[PDB]
Amino acid sequence: SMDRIIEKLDHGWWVVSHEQKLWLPKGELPYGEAANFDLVGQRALQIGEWQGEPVWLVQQQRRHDMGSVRQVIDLDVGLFQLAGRGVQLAEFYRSHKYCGYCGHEMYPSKTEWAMLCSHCRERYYPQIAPCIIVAIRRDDSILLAQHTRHRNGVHTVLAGFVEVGETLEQAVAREVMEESGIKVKNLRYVTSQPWPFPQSLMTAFMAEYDSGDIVIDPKELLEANWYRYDDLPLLPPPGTVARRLIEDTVAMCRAEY
């Protein structure tokens, strides 16, 4: 945990963020010495380190080239995760200018990433929202769906935020039943992924069909169907955990059929 003024001798990867945006001059995550980005004398937070290079967060906005961290998703996974960290932390501090409990103004910790209240005894820590995402397998088929919320002509797997007081398993069961009306069996954890859009922690699952006919919630899904492994529609981009689930499923179907 390092929170200080930037000197000429400071260098590395610079996450310059404001309101869920980051500064991408030339579509690049800023790299190099501080003076080369006019950051000398600017307050900054070291949010990590990638291959010897410190990753910094600067809470300011520029005039041009502000955009989504999704633009730099083709970088090393660890570096992308660190940039996402920058964006999330800036949005956290911005989200806690005032105390939710008593309405007084808050101030940063110096121990950790946290916002402490001057008046009352309350704290906040950056919010990570756990999410489930599951690829459901049926024999030689996988269930894929088009999403109502944002339309893209891409078919993908099922996802949803975990609720308070429920386990990941219950969250998969609940989300799947709510969206498609079917029941699954043989839940299988695969991996997890930080998804700063805005603040989700993905937990990825494989599952098999159990029973029920596909009955969709139109507020969430435009349509959903069983697609055989060999003849697939349009998939989410590689680099996302969704495509990865889809393709573990597919590779498995091929290998087994």
Ligand X SMILES: NC(=O)c1ccc[n+]([C@@H]2O[C@H](COP(=O)([O-])OP(=O)(O)OC[C@H]3O[C@@H](n4cnc5c(N)ncnc54)[C@H](O)[C@@H]3O)[C@@H](O)[C@H]2O)c1
Interface contacts to ligand X, rule CB under 6 A: 125, 129, 131, 133, 149, 159-161, 193, 195, 197, 200, 202, 236, 240-242
Query: Rule CB under 8 A: is residue 79 a binding residue for a copy of itself?
Result: no
Binding mask 49-88 for Zn ion (x = CB under 5 A): ----------------------------------------
**C-alpha distances out from residue 248 to 114, 199, 255, Å:** 38, 26, 10
**What three-state secondary structure class fits 16?**
strand
Site for Zn ion in 196-225 (CB under 5 A): none
For residue 64, give every residue at least 6 positions away whose Cβ sits within 8 Å of its Cβ, in sequence order, or none: 25
CB of 101 to a copy of itself, least distance (A): 6
**C-alpha distances out from residue 76 to 72, 196, 235, Å:** 9, 16, 22
Q: Of ligand X, a copy of itself, Zn ion, none, which one does residue 117 interact with (CB within 5 to 8 Å by kind)?
A: Zn ion
Site for Zn ion in 99-118 (CB under 5 A): 99, 101-102, 104, 117
Number of residue whose CB is nearest Zn ion: 99
Number of residues that bind Zn ion (CB under 5 A): 8
**What three-state secondary structure class fits 205?**
strand
Query: Rule CB under 8 A: is residue 164 a binding residue for a copy of itself?
Result: yes
Q: Of ligand X, Zn ion, a copy of itself, none, which one does residue 237 interact with (CB within 5 to 8 Å by kind)?
A: none
Q: 126 preceded by cis ω (within 30°)?
A: no
- Closest C-alpha among 245, 237, 227 to residue 158: 245
Query: Rule CB under 8 A: is residue 129 a binding residue for a copy of itself?
Result: yes
**d(C-alpha 208, C-alpha 91), whole Å:** 38
Q: Of Zn ion, ligand X, a copy of itself, none, which one does residue 166 interact with (CB within 5 to 8 Å by kind)?
A: a copy of itself
Q: Phi, psi at residue 81, to the nearest 5°?
A: -60, -40
Q: What tokens does 172 get? A: 């998969």
Q: Of all helices (H) and strands (E), which one includes residue 169?
A: helix 168-180
Number of residues that bind a copy of itself (CB under 8 A): 47
Binding mask 122-161 for Zn ion (x = CB under 5 A): x---------------------------------------
DSSP, residue by residue, 115-152: EEESSSS-EE----EEEEEEEEEETTEEEEEEESSS--
Query: Rule CB under 8 A: is residue 100 a binding residue for a copy of itself?
Result: yes
Q: Of Zn ion, a copy of itself, ligand X, none, which one does residue 203 interact with (CB within 5 to 8 Å by kind)?
A: a copy of itself
